[PDB]
Amino acid sequence: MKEECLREDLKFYFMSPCEKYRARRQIPWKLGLQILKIVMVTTQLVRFGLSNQLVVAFKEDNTVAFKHLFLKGYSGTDEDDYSCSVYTQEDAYESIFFAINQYHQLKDITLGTLGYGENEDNRIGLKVCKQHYKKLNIDNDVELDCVQLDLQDLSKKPPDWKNSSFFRLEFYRLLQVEISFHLKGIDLQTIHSRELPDCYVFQNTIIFDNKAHSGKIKIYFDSDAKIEECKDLNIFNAQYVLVFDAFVIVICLASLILCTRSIVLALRLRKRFLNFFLEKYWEFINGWYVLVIISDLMTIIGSILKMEIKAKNLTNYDLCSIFLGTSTLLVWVGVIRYLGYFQAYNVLILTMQASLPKVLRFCACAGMIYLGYTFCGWIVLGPYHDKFENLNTVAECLFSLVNGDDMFATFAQIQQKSILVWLFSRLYLYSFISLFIYMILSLFIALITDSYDTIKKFQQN
Amino acid sequence: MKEECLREDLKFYFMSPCEKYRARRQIPWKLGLQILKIVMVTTQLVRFGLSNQLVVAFKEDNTVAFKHLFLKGYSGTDEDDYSCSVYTQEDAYESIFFAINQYHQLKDITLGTLGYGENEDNRIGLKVCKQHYKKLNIDNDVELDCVQLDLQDLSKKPPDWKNSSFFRLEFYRLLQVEISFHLKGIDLQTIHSRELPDCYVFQNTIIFDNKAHSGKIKIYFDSDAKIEECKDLNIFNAQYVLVFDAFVIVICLASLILCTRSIVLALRLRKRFLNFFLEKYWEFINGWYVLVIISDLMTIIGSILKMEIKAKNLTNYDLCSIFLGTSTLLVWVGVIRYLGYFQAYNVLILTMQASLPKVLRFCACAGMIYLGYTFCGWIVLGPYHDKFENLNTVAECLFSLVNGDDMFATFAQIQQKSILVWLFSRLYLYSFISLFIYMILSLFIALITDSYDTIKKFQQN
Amino acid sequence: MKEECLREDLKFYFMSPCEKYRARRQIPWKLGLQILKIVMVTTQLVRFGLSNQLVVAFKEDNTVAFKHLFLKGYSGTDEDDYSCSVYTQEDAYESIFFAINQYHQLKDITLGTLGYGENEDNRIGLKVCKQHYKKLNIDNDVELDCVQLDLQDLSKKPPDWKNSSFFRLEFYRLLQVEISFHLKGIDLQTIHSRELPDCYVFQNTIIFDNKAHSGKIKIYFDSDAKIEECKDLNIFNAQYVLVFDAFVIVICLASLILCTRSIVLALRLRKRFLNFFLEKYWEFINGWYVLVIISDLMTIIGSILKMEIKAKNLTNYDLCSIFLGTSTLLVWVGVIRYLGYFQAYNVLILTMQASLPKVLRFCACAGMIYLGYTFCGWIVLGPYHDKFENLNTVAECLFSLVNGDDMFATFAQIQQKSILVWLFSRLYLYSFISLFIYMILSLFIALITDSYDTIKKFQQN
């Protein structure tokens, strides 16, 4: 009879929860737990996205306002990773002096709720530091020299800092000039909700940088905002977020227990089944359960990081967003397990799994050609094309070209001044596009759609 | 003999009108009615589009002229949903004062036929309203304060409004400043046709908005134009439009009667046929007739809304255009019924219907992956990418990426300042594009083109 | 024996010229004539393109220089079909006065070889014409008023034209102001080749246009250049072009004779062959010969127009370029006849011809859906999208969308201010793209590639 029991157990382990309830009236509380997990994970992600969106928007708006206030002739958009640049010793001095003067007159210029902030030494003021190669006759040692400009110093009606010997820069040895100051800000966008407003501290540095010594000074503006207590403010939900993240952890922790319990009970049946198939003469490792375990781990980690961020009032949410986003992606991918219960949808999951090994084998061959083209394009078209400047950019450009993106602009960005490089670029682009788009991907398509012929006839039989 | 009669009736119901006329000399006046309906529906839509195009063009041109007249240093294109922005207390005051001064000198500045308009209180002038948080020590109650500036007040040779205590704004509590005025305009573009010119009233508001309190004031210019009687004007087709819309209603109403009569007579034959197949041992619901009924309903509704709009002289034609456009789309789709009479074209309508269920089943699986990627991309790349700012934008970006659109720019819009987010964006984009473009759509293609193998061999047999 | 003669004739008519020479030693002078025709037609087209490219470049460069000289604050690129626009009565007067003043000082401002030209009345000067509605109280009659400003009038040291009653414009009735003048130019780019330089006459009009009466004056600059004799010039190939165009006509005329002779001799064999198949019990109309006849006609017409243009010194080469370009396209398409002699390439011409009827039948069904979407998109998204403004633009936008072009920008160009139209645009774009790109074109592909299965197995058997 134990043979019949083993057969009935193996039949039970292979049927859908709907069929389990139809047959043996076993309630699918694990399925309900998973649906609840989907709903709560998505809810937590959406709430987190909305709140952190608000905070990031406030910080970026303040940074843009600071750039308009302190960078002379700022166009409103960054030239590059740096905000603006100058090419003349006079434009350089005017940019520096403009920044200092705008800081002096901050209260009469700003449109927001800005104020001067105490620095790291607990004194309101402006710090200017400059680095020179100490001296045609220059040593490699950099001579740093700083000055602390108070509000009293800048507010002297005859200004003495402008004429001081500090601001006479020898631009041929200059490495950089850095201006540092602190500002205190309040977002009044929140007080309509009776929430006490959040007070932020901005640590701003303007770097007038010519490490390149190529005739251009690049001006970088960096604003680092942190959240501090509102020391002085009179304006006539932390628990709810924290408990919700605890419920998400508990549910995800419970799903970890149930899935691992399910996997263990599956391996027990494999042990039993081999016994009946050792005397008479991935099936029990569900690949969906591995995905569910990874998703639960990532959701727990992301929730712990989120609670830590909210507890100690931090504003960088990158790593927590990367864990929560990946876990949500995997949860929504794992919903495909419930659809695959209905065999009508299963034949479409099987057609992808069958095509995967041929795709991987084919990527090995196409990958080598792709790498060769990447190296060639970087070494040749690097000095003459902005889509080929470094290797990572070349890889992305070739990927986009394979997908047809921006072909004419890519062809037209090579100036015909060098005839040899122009001819080579034409040959390179034509050969890469023809080869990859018309042999490589056609063979690839052919491999996949026809492998999907066999799953289609294999399920018919 | 009644069996022969039933067979002849079922044979009659299944033959094309061309065959009906060839066999029993029955004139296809229903087909002629449908062709007339196609022609008149398209004619009405084209006439409506041309006229409303004219009106919208006039309104937009006047709005652009107003922005150039009243917004200081307007670049000619909107920065965003708002027209322009300022970052300094002095630029803010100059924008406000420029708007007021340009309104004062309107007659000497405008190039069109503009005049001052009486406001809601029937007095020519300008209204300025400002909102502050009533008072570091601010309450949540907003204190509104308005002033009505007449033409006499602005025309005083020593201007007193500039120096008044109203325009001393405390920008740290300011919520917004709103300037409201009315203008009367005439389009003389019509008088070449003996038509009396249409006189419009523009209700203009300029909003100097800093609800964000982020250091930037956004300036919104909104012009609401309505059509009024020309009270004073001396310049040395309504019936035709209204009757035409009545004929469109009648024809569409008639097509509703005939199609519903046809459907009822079809269900009678189903009743009869089952009787012969209950003793001896969608075919009668034509899916085209459902489309024709929906199209007739939408055309009647759109025509009624159109007549209402023309009767009471309204200028918002959105809902009427959405009904008329959808009804015209459905009419031109329904022309495919006449082509499908010829079986040579029928095998191509059958190949799409057969492929539809597999497409829908496949969308369920691909939709879950798409949703997971949407959530992940929004939560992670939202703060660092303008194509991922909100969920709807992320969905559109992923759709465009699947279709290959703007891949290199999408790859290049992530600044490499955060190495972790940059690496994740690379992984995210590569995985999404590879997965969707090379497994998902290949299986999809394979499903559809091969299902079109079976209709092709199924019609051969 | 006449039966054997008929069979031998039909065998002769169906073999390639290479086989004709291999068998009966018949020289293929017709093939040599066709190769000569290809070479000479392409040569004529290339020479014509190079010369007319030079002339067009000169004219466009002069027009750009004129726009910079006479249009105030010209940005260097046209705003629209019009060059620039103004919105103020003062900017309007300054633009007009700037144009007149720059004309007065032309000799001291121009960088080229420009001079004043006599007008249609043979007098050097400037003409200003203005149109008003003759007079709140305006009649539909337009009152035109012109003034002729001589160089003496503009050169009076106290200028009297500025203060004259002519230039007091009532902008509320103004239709337009037009400024007309002539300039004489010489291109010295030619004298390096001993060719006498070509002297051109520019007829320039500046139109300050506010027919719309919408508050904006659009400024159009039109320069019409013609070539005249150099009356006064001292600088210390017409036959060759004309004879070459005569040889092209002769060769194309000869090819017309030979092809029509070939077609007639083909129809004689059809007559004979039916006689043998009327007692015993496109094959003779070569579709390539129709193409060759059309190409010869077009080349002769284009050459005649080209000779006429060169004879009477005209500078508009549009119609001649459209005939020559189409004839060259058809010649290079007709080269496919020689490749199709080798049966290895023939099976690829047969696969396209076989697929054509299914493509045409399918376009009829897809065309109706395309038309419905075009009408719907124009009526709804016309007022809110610049890619949907008129019907032709909508058709091009839908074509590009089917080919995947600029999908994200199309999705993002609809402002979300109107929620109803925004939702409809989302639904419209998603439905059109999904439908056309994933059912319509998949069925199409499937039709074509599989019809190419049958030609591939039909030639095997």
Next chain:
Amino acid sequence: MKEECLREDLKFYFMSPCEKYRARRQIPWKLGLQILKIVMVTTQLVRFGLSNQLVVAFKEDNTVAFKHLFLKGYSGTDEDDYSCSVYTQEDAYESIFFAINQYHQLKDITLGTLGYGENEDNRIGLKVCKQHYKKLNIDNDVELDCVQLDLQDLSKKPPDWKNSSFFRLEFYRLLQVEISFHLKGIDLQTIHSRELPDCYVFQNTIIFDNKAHSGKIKIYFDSDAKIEECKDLNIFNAQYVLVFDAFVIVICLASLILCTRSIVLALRLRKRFLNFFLEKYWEFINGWYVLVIISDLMTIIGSILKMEIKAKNLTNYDLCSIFLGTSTLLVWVGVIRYLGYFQAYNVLILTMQASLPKVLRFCACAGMIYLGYTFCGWIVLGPYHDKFENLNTVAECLFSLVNGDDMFATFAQIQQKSILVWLFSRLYLYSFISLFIYMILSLFIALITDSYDTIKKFQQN
């Protein structure tokens, strides 16, 4: 027994090196040599790319700074191949005078380590040369006139060069004005590494060019930088690069010997095998070895050019980069030989080789249509479209259109001013896109994927 020996030799020659070592314990030192070659070739290319990237970046940054210093009102981006342009005799004089004045005040304006350089005559100064047609009455001989402006001449407090008769240009005969000077620069970006800094000499020419005589002067700025010894400089790895390039040559030279030895031993076996198949009754030319020989030749040539460049301190690395990049591309393509040892990957290399002849035969037919469309589009749309200006641009535009790139912009770049050309452009673009994208490429796909059906069933059998 010699028959058995011949069979064993032929079996040895056809087995993979892994199988050779598995069977006869023969170490695959040739395979190890090839892997070492891959690693060292890639290493050399990456090092070369990084260093030449640094040098090119320095030169381009200095050129940009020079353009900002000496070109008046330079926008920061080049208008075209020329940097900027002027249209007035006054803007022309101001640009020339601005360049000369900025050169005079170089030491007080530059942000980098710039100094005056001795010219070709070994004298510090500025040279201005002008070309006129010597004199309505102009001869074809160009009269060149130069002036050498010293620092003493420009530094005279009353400047005499401005008022001199040299700078009175007759712009109607002017061909060009050229300003030439030398600058000495040092990149201090290197001294942090104890490397003595590299001193560069810049030979700058500003060309005020109006050869066209079309009313516009184009201003070209060309900077030619070379590396010279630092004559005067006090700042408190050549061998390693040179030896590494020698090892790359040796390894590539060795691979040439081994591959050619392998090919010869292969042809010996062909000779022997035919003997056994001459009495009883590409297989021995490996196509990979041809690729390896070509790659070794190119790597040796590129390394020799690289050593020559580094030895004599040259800064143009184009030809050397084209040889090294092509050789690296071919090395990474040749790695596909090792994967093809495993027959699982071999069937994917065989499917491409089998499809190649059909692709080539098909390109001959499609190429003729492509050429016809190219000629037609250039001759017709050349004067009205910037993507059709010359034949090479037309070819690239049609290639991009076939790949779907920028279709709507291509459709919209034709102004509707000429109705005939506009209609023809619509017809041209629609016909080309429909034809090529929907018949030509569908037949092509069909040819390739189905040929990949036969290799797939041919390897099964």
